[PDB]
Design a protein around this ligand. Structure first.
Ligand SMILES: COc1ccc(C(=O)Oc2c(Br)cc(Br)cc2CNC(=O)c2ccccc2[N+](=O)[O-])cc1
Ligand SMILES: COc1ccc(C(=O)Oc2c(Br)cc(Br)cc2CNC(=O)c2ccccc2[N+](=O)[O-])cc1
Ligand SMILES: N[C@@H](Cc1ccccc1)C(=O)O
Lengths: 160, 160
């Protein structure tokens, strides 16, 4: 894990982060961090390899206000898994459908809360054939991801 | 199961459960301390564990919260600090050692609502190399435990 802090700068950190993620089995990741008491996303540090069209669609649709993982992150340090039960309203369900259409079906979101009030999320999606396989996979990797998120937060807050 | 923390009733039961989970991971002495957001003193701290009373009393009376290097580390990072040796810092390590607390680590706690604290755990060992091997062997499980303790503990201390 210390290779993240020991990376040279943004590009090497992003690739190392995305590579640790792929080695664990997640082809898609997004790390997002805001400074303490941020009012909007003008100063957000957001990196990863989510598809561009989905990044753009989520911004244009204002999905930070509907995505249930975002409100979760304001309330907890524990992971939220992407499962049917977290999409309660129709509007959350169609967030779910559009993420799915973009290729992001199975996954989880780890909240980020830094020592200087930084607020963020590390999200990772796994390409699996059904929820049973996705869940099995995530169990096997969860303790390692649990460390990764804090090593990512501490190093990324230093970079950002 | 981490679930038994969230379902406990009252600080006695919670602290017992946490102490047992730690003991199972090889740690005989632990201290969980948590302050509300932007605390200026320790008057509203929630501190539970099985550190010895004489050591707790000494640490407070001697002002060791201003000396102990783990405390400033927690204000600056989410990553753990392993216990490894200023002249007052020299005094601090000697007196901890005299109290039986020689090897261990402190896991900083940064809550979703700005709670600040630490989960400190001591391991009994023949020497530091052996202590290190004992801690490394359980570090992924401890990493999950500290965040479960923080999420449940914040509720117990400040909300329910
Ligand atoms: C206030 O502090 C914050 C808030 C938010 C983010 C943050 O990274 O949010 C974003 C952004 Br910005 C853009 C996209 Br595209 C996606 C997310 C997160 N959601 C999922 O991955 C997700 C979550 C559940 C299901 C599907 C997905 N998905 O996007 O495919 C960071 C810091
Ligand atoms: C940032 O908000 C905070 C700050 C601090 C604590 C916190 O719990 O601090 C305490 C207290 Br209060 C009493 C004692 Br006794 C010990 C500690 C911590 N140090 C060690 O365990 C230690 C650390 C290194 C080596 C040895 C030891 N040891 O005590 O044996 C909680 C919340
Ligand atoms: N990295 C910035 C602080 C920062 C943290 C998180 C997000 C954005 C900025 C300094 O140095």
């Amino acid at each position: 894990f210390l290779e993240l802090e020991r990376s040279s700068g943004k590009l090497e950190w992003s690739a190392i982060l995305q590579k640790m993620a792929s080695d664990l089995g997640f082809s898609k990741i997004l790390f997002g961090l805001l400074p303490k008491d941020s009012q909007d996303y003008e100063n957000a540090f957001i990196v990863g390899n989510y598809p561009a069209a989905w990044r753009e669609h989520y911004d244009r649709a204002g999905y930070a206000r509907v995505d249930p993982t975002v409100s979760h992150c304001t309330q907890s340090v524990l992971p939220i898994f992407w499962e049917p039960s977290i999409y309660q309203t129709r509007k959350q369900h169609e967030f779910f459908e559009e993420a799915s259409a973009a290729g992001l079906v199975y996954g989880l979101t780890m909240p980020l809360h830094g020592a200087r009030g930084e607020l963020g999320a590390l999200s990772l999606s796994v390409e699996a054939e059904n929820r049973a396989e996705a869940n099995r996979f995530m169990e096997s990797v969860l303790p390692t991801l649990w460390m990764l998120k804090d090593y990512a937060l501490q190093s990324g807050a230093g970079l950002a």
